[PDB]
Every structure is written in structure tokens, then in C-alpha cells.
RNA sequence: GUGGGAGAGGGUGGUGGAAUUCCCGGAGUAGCGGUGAAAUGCGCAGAUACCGGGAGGAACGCCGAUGGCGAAGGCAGCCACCUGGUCCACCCGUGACGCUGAGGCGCGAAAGCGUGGGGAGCAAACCGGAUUAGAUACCCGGGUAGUCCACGCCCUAAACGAUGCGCGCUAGGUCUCUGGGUCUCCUGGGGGCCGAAGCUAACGCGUUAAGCGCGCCGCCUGGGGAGUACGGCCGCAAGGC
């Protein structure tokens, strides 16, 4: 019961999966869902409809604490990335700002033979 | 869409300590301008590109920014 | 003997005394390297871009110096040393190549 | 480094008569100045390549320079290494 | 020589931020990851996703180019120091001091060797999961040498423009980097594209010749046998000429 009301949702999206997490303001997180959670299993848990359902779980369970007003961070590219947030939109959280944090190395690391 | 230095008076292109002039050569991240937005010359762009990056090292610019709307 | 624009930025944190202190040290540190002072600038409270050792802000004060270039390096190996000078750069003069002329 | 100064020095002390910039005596010195700091220098700095080859070169030069004012005045010759500390 | 410049040319120190990984911490469930689809794998000893701090190695996004530098290999964060090449203007100095260059000597990507460090990500070998008529190869999950630094070897290559260096000559147009000018233009030095004459078996090349010439060095003489054998020299070896 940590009464918040106001707070920040991530959304991680990936080729693969897609999840998404609701935290305060300061970011410690609230309660969060994924495709995986949603029922879904295989490669079926990366597609947008997936994306949609997961947004969907955490914004109702945003709901049972409280949740109204909803600050919006994308990290991540892939199907169903921007599902998730007009599934959100759809939601009755009312979403304040989206901003677009998918990280990028400065030219650091080397990556897998899959990516080169 | 006109270009960066269509709209500036004279400015030293060296002046790194000098921000008000130089956010004008950035993104909405932290990216310096391509040379097709700022409108410089070659000696121009890479004089520029320096002294951003020296200032970005004494903490006057940001190295990278997070991206609204979309 | 070269032309140099040292940079010193530091905690916002400091009082009087403190301040006093730091720049009193700095003042110590150019005379003792051979480092003459042309002149100097003090912006002092500034914005920073990003956070700097977990603050949002920084001090700053420039320095027009005259000084022998096989020094310099320890001269800034020497600035540095205390906590609470947060960065130093330093640079060769350079003439103001200008732009939009 | 070489101040214009420090160097018009060397210029002032080889010159065959006033004025005189291009003459063989003062290619001759303004070289060996240039190849003893570059050899001060490849001593620490032992990995440095590029630079090393610039030696070579210079030191090809002043050689040309020499077997010249040998072939052509023995005298300005014998003087000139004397000066210098070589061959 | 004087004056003016452009530059990831080099060597040494220092330093900055993004990211990956790992450690600590808070919050927080039930998954995550991954593929065509799966499975190995990781996760109630609390993962993934999110926030704060910490440690460490490696590589520098945007700028960045159809760009720059170097003889070649090669060379991209920022700063300082040490240093190489090179372009232009002035027409000042010397007075043929020039070109090429068997041999020698130096440099020489990656992999590889020796000694000692360092080791985050990647990852030959390897251990596994899967696909398939069978992986043992492609796909997935781990992973050691190695990759990184010091010193000393190794001398290879599609080390390529598959085009040896230097000089003179022979329409132009166009784009471009860097100088100087009386700055629509002109003049010099690079980088590209069309194309005069000419060359070429054709493809093509064409003031950055593959054209017209002179100098000098290297190399070729059907295809295999064969970069093999033998001998020599170098090398700790692998192996090289
Ligand atoms: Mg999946
Ligand atoms: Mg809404
Ligand atoms: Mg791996
Ligand atoms: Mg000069
Ligand atoms: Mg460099
Ligand atoms: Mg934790
Ligand atoms: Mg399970
Ligand atoms: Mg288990
Ligand atoms: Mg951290
Ligand atoms: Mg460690
Ligand atoms: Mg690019
Ligand atoms: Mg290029
Ligand atoms: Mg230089
Ligand atoms: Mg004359
Ligand atoms: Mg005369
Ligand atoms: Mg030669
Ligand atoms: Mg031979
Ligand atoms: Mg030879
Ligand atoms: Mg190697
Ligand atoms: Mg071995
Ligand atoms: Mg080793
Ligand atoms: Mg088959
Ligand atoms: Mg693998
Ligand atoms: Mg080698
Ligand atoms: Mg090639
Ligand atoms: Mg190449
Ligand atoms: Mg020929
Ligand atoms: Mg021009
Ligand atoms: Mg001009
Ligand atoms: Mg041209
Ligand atoms: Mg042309
Ligand atoms: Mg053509
Ligand atoms: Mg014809
Ligand atoms: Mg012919
Ligand atoms: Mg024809
Ligand atoms: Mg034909
Ligand atoms: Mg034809
Ligand atoms: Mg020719
Ligand atoms: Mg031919
Ligand atoms: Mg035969
Ligand atoms: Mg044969
Ligand atoms: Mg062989
Ligand atoms: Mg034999
Ligand atoms: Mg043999
Ligand atoms: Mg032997
Ligand atoms: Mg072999």
C-alpha cells in the first residue's frame, strides 16, 4: 500500500521480449509485467500484441497503488516497442512525457560475432 | 531550416570556456551538428568540433541527452 | 616560455576561508613552477552540463599564463592533488580565429 | 625546439660572408644542429619510427653536402669538419 | 633562408564520458534469455527490468566525408611535452651539389614464439543445446589460448591502384581538401569524376596515363609436377628467403 499517484514507467523493449516497470519518482520500482508474465512463452513473447497486454497488467497494477499521472522512458528498439506505449495511452494512467533512453555505447565494447 | 551561422553575430570558433554560443551547435542529444545544419567550412567544422569536445571535457556541454516526444 | 589558459573548476561547497585557501594554494603552485600570471577570470558559480563528483554545479576560474613548457605537466599533476579541485585543464594560447566574418 | 633565434645564432656563425644563408658551410651546420637534437631526442623515445627515418634522411643530406665541398674545396672542407666534431 | 599554413604522421606522460561486465545497496516478482522454432543456460541463496554508489579492462558515438596524414605497413576522445614529413609566398643565399640504386642496414597488418604483467567484451581449441540422412559445420548456450601493456623474436599477405622511382611533354569540363592572389575568376600542391589526341586484345587508361619520351632498378618466357625436392642462410619454434 506505498501510495505513489505519480511515477515513472519504463519500458525495456528487445527482439525477443518486451517488458515494463512502474517505480516513484526517485525510481525504485512499484510493480512491473513482461511478455513472459503475461501468459506468453516462445519467440510469440516479443510481438506487439504481447507488448500491449504487458503494459496493460502493469498499468492495472499501477492502478492498485495508486497510480495517476505517468512519466514515460523508452529503452530498447523492436516490434512492439511503441505497442507499449499507445497501450499505455490506452490505459487511464495519463502519461506526461515519453523520452527516448535506449543507451549507446560511445564505441567501447566489442559485440558478438552476431552483431558485426 | 536555415543554417546555424546564417543567425550569429562574429564569434570566436576557438572559445571553448564560451556555452552560449556553442549550444547552438548541438542536438537535441548531445551530438554536434552535421556540417549540412551548422553551414561551415571544413576548417570551420573540425575548429568547431574541438572546442565543443573541450568543453564538454570541463563540463560545460553535454556528452549525450535524452530525446522528448515520439 | 608559452602562453597558457589554465582552467580551474571546483566544489561549489566552499565558504570564504576555504575558497581563500584553494586559491591561495593555486597562487603557490604557479609561482613555485615558474608559471608568471597574465591575467585572470573568476565565473564562479556555474551550471554544469552533466554532474561532476555527484554535484550539479561547479566553480570556475580561468588563468592567462606565461610559463616553461617542460614544467607545465607537473604543474598540473600539482594542481590536481588537492580533493577539492574537481577539474584543471590546460591549454596553449591559441589567437581567436573567428567566424560568420 | 628551434627558436628562429637560437638558430640565425648558428646562421651568424657560419655565414661565409654577410648575408650569406645558402652557402654549403651553413647547410652543413643548420643540418648537424638538427640531426644532434634528433638523436638526443631517438635515445628515450627509442620506439619512434617515423621520426628515426627522418634522421636517415638528413643525415643523407648533410653526407651529400659534405662529399660535394670535399670534391670542390678540400681546404673549406678540413675547416668545416674541424668546426663540427666529425668524420 | 625568411615569413605563412593544413593535418587520425610519430613517441612519452596525463585525463574524460557513454557502454559491457562484476561487487555493494534500496525497491520489487517470476521469470529472463535465446531461435525460423526450440533447448541447453541463468533465476525463490530473489534473477530479469529500475534507482544510488563502487572496481576494473578495453575501445572512443555525434563531428566523419565520395575528408586528412604517412614511403609502406598503417594512423580517429581531449590535454601537454618531445619529434618527422610536406605545401605555399617572397626571388633573398649556394652554384649541378642531380636521378636511380644489385648489396647492405632499418621499417614492416594480422596471426604466431619467449619472459613478465593485465584480463571487462569478444573468442581458435574445447564442453554443451539444437537443426539434419549424421554435426562432428552453419543456429543457440558456456569457454581457454589469444586480443591489451613492457621487452625480445618472427618478415608474411589480395603488404592492391594486382600499376617500381624520377623528369619533360600532350584539349577541356566538373566535384573537392589546403595555401597565395588585385578573391564571378586566377595561380600552386593533394584527392575524385567525365572526357581531346593517343594507347589497349578487349575491358578499359587518358596532365593522379595504361599517351609521347629519357635514365635507372626489379621481374617474366606454355600448363601441371611446385613454392615441392636438394643445398645454403636466417629462426627458440612455427617457419621464412
Ligand atoms: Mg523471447
Ligand atoms: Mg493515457
Ligand atoms: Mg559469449
Ligand atoms: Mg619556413
Ligand atoms: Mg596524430
Ligand atoms: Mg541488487
Ligand atoms: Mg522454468
Ligand atoms: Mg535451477
Ligand atoms: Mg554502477
Ligand atoms: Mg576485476
Ligand atoms: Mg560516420
Ligand atoms: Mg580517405
Ligand atoms: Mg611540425
Ligand atoms: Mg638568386
Ligand atoms: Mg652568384
Ligand atoms: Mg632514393
Ligand atoms: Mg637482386
Ligand atoms: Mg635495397
Ligand atoms: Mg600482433
Ligand atoms: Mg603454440
Ligand atoms: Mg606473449
Ligand atoms: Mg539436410
Ligand atoms: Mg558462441
Ligand atoms: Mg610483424
Ligand atoms: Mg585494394
Ligand atoms: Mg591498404
Ligand atoms: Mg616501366
Ligand atoms: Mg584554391
Ligand atoms: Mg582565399
Ligand atoms: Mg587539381
Ligand atoms: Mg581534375
Ligand atoms: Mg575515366
Ligand atoms: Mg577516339
Ligand atoms: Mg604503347
Ligand atoms: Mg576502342
Ligand atoms: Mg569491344
Ligand atoms: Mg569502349
Ligand atoms: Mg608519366
Ligand atoms: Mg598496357
Ligand atoms: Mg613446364
Ligand atoms: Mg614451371
Ligand atoms: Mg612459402
Ligand atoms: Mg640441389
Ligand atoms: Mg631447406
Ligand atoms: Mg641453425
Ligand atoms: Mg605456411
Same mark, same amino acid.
Given at each position: 500500500?506505498?501510495?505513489?499517484?505519480?511515477?515513472?514507467?519504463?519500458?525495456?523493449?528487445?527482439?525477443?521480449?518486451?517488458? =515494463?516497470?512502474?517505480?516513484?519518482?526517485?525510481?525504485?520500482?512499484?510493480?512491473?509485467?513482461?511478455? $513472459?508474465?503475461?501468459?506468453?512463452?516462445?519467440?510469440?513473447?516479443?510481438?506487439?500484441?504481447?507488448?500491449? +497486454?504487458?503494459? +496493460?497488467?502493469?498499468?492495472?497494477?499501477?492502478?492498485?497503488?495508486?497510480?495517476?499521472?505517468?512519466? =514515460?522512458? =523508452?529503452?530498447?528498439? $523492436?516490434?512492439?516497442?511503441?505497442?507499449?506505449?499507445?497501450?499505455?495511452?490506452?490505459? $487511464? +494512467?495519463?502519461?506526461?512525457?515519453?523520452?527516448?533512453?535506449?543507451? =549507446?555505447?560511445?564505441? $567501447?565494447?566489442?559485440?558478438?560475432?552476431?552483431?558485426? | 531550416?536555415?543554417?546555424?551561422?546564417?543567425?550569429?553575430?562574429?564569434?570566436?570558433?576557438?572559445?571553448?570556456?564560451?556555452?552560449?554560443?556553442?549550444?547552438?551547435?548541438?542536438?537535441?542529444?548531445?551530438?554536434?551538428?552535421?556540417?549540412?545544419?551548422?553551414?561551415?567550412?571544413?576548417?570551420?567544422?573540425?575548429?568547431?568540433?574541438?572546442?565543443?569536445?573541450?568543453?564538454?571535457?570541463?563540463?560545460?556541454?553535454?556528452?549525450?541527452?535524452?530525446?522528448?516526444?515520439? | 616560455?608559452?602562453?597558457?589558459?589554465? /582552467?580551474?573548476?571546483? /566544489?561549489?561547497?566552499?565558504?570564504?576561508?576555504?575558497?581563500?585557501?584553494?586559491?591561495?594554494?593555486?597562487?603557490? *603552485?604557479?609561482?613555485?613552477?615558474?608559471?608568471?600570471?597574465?591575467?585572470?577570470?573568476? @565565473?564562479?558559480?556555474?551550471?554544469? *552540463?552533466?554532474?561532476?563528483?555527484?554535484?550539479?554545479?561547479?566553480?570556475? @576560474?580561468?588563468?592567462?599564463?606565461?610559463?616553461?613548457?617542460?614544467?607545465? /605537466?607537473? @604543474?598540473?599533476?600539482?594542481?590536481?592533488?588537492?580533493?577539492?579541485?574537481?577539474?584543471?585543464?590546460?591549454?596553449?594560447?591559441?589567437?581567436?580565429?573567428?567566424?560568420?566574418? | 625546439?628551434?627558436?628562429?633565434?637560437?638558430?640565425?645564432?648558428?646562421?651568424?656563425?657560419?655565414?661565409?660572408?654577410?648575408?650569406?644563408? &645558402? !652557402?654549403?658551410?651553413?647547410?652543413?651546420?643548420?643540418?648537424?644542429?638538427?640531426?644532434? #637534437?634528433? !638523436?638526443?631526442?631517438?635515445?628515450?623515445?627509442?620506439?619512434?619510427?617515423? !621520426?628515426?627515418? &627522418?634522421?636517415?634522411?638528413?643525415? &643523407?643530406?648533410?653526407?651529400?653536402?659534405? #662529399?660535394?665541398?670535399?670534391?670542390?674545396?678540400?681546404?673549406?672542407?678540413?675547416?668545416?669538419?674541424?668546426?663540427? &666534431?666529425? #668524420?
Amino acid at each position: 500500500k506505498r501510495q505513489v499517484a505519480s511515477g515513472r514507467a519504463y519500458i525495456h523493449a528487445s527482439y525477443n521480449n518486451t517488458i =515494463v516497470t512502474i517505480t516513484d519518482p526517485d525510481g525504485n520500482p512499484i510493480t512491473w509485467s513482461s511478455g $513472459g508474465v503475461i501468459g506468453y512463452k516462445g519467440s510469440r513473447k516479443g510481438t506487439p500484441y504481447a507488448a500491449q +497486454l504487458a503494459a +496493460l497488467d502493469a498499468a492495472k497494477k499501477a492502478m492498485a497503488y495508486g497510480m495517476q499521472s505517468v512519466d =514515460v522512458i =523508452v529503452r530498447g528498439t $523492436g516490434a512492439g516497442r511503441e505497442q507499449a506505449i499507445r497501450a499505455l495511452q490506452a490505459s $487511464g +494512467l495519463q502519461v506526461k512525457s515519453i523520452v527516448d533512453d535506449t543507451p =549507446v555505447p560511445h564505441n $567501447g565494447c566489442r559485440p558478438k560475432k552476431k552483431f558485426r | 531550416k536555415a543554417k546555424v551561422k546564417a543567425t550569429l553575430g562574429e564569434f570566436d570558433l576557438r572559445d571553448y570556456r564560451n556555452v552560449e554560443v556553442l549550444k547552438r551547435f548541438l542536438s537535441e542529444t548531445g551530438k554536434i551538428l552535421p556540417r549540412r545544419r551548422t553551414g561551415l567550412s571544413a576548417k570551420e567544422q573540425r575548429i568547431l568540433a574541438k572546442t565543443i569536445k573541450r568543453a564538454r571535457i570541463l563540463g560545460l556541454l553535454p556528452f549525450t541527452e535524452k530525446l522528448v516526444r515520439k | 616560455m608559452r602562453r597558457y589558459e589554465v /582552467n580551474i573548476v571546483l /566544489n561549489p561547497n566552499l565558504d570564504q576561508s576555504q575558497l581563500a585557501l584553494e586559491k591561495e594554494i593555486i597562487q603557490r *603552485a604557479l609561482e613555485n613552477y615558474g608559471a608568471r600570471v597574465e591575467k585572470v577570470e573568476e @565565473l564562479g558559480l556555474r551550471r554544469l *552540463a552533466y554532474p561532476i563528483a555527484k554535484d550539479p554545479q561547479g566553480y570556475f @576560474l580561468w588563468y592567462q599564463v606565461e610559463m616553461p613548457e617542460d614544467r607545465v /605537466n607537473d @604543474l598540473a599533476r600539482e594542481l590536481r592533488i588537492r580533493d577539492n579541485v574537481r577539474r584543471v585543464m590546460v591549454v596553449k594560447s591559441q589567437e581567436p580565429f573567428l567566424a560568420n566574418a | 625546439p628551434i627558436t628562429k633565434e637560437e638558430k640565425q645564432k648558428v646562421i651568424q656563425e657560419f655565414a661565409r660572408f654577410p648575408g650569406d644563408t &645558402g !652557402s654549403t658551410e651553413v647547410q652543413v651546420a643548420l643540418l648537424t644542429l638538427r640531426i644532434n #637534437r634528433l !638523436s638526443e631526442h631517438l635515445k628515450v623515445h627509442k620506439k619512434d619510427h617515423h !621520426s628515426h627515418r &627522418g634522421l636517415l634522411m638528413m643525415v &643523407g643530406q648533410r653526407r651529400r653536402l659534405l #662529399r660535394y665541398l670535399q670534391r670542390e674545396d678540400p681546404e673549406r672542407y678540413r675547416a668545416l669538419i674541424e668546426k663540427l &666534431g666529425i #668524420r
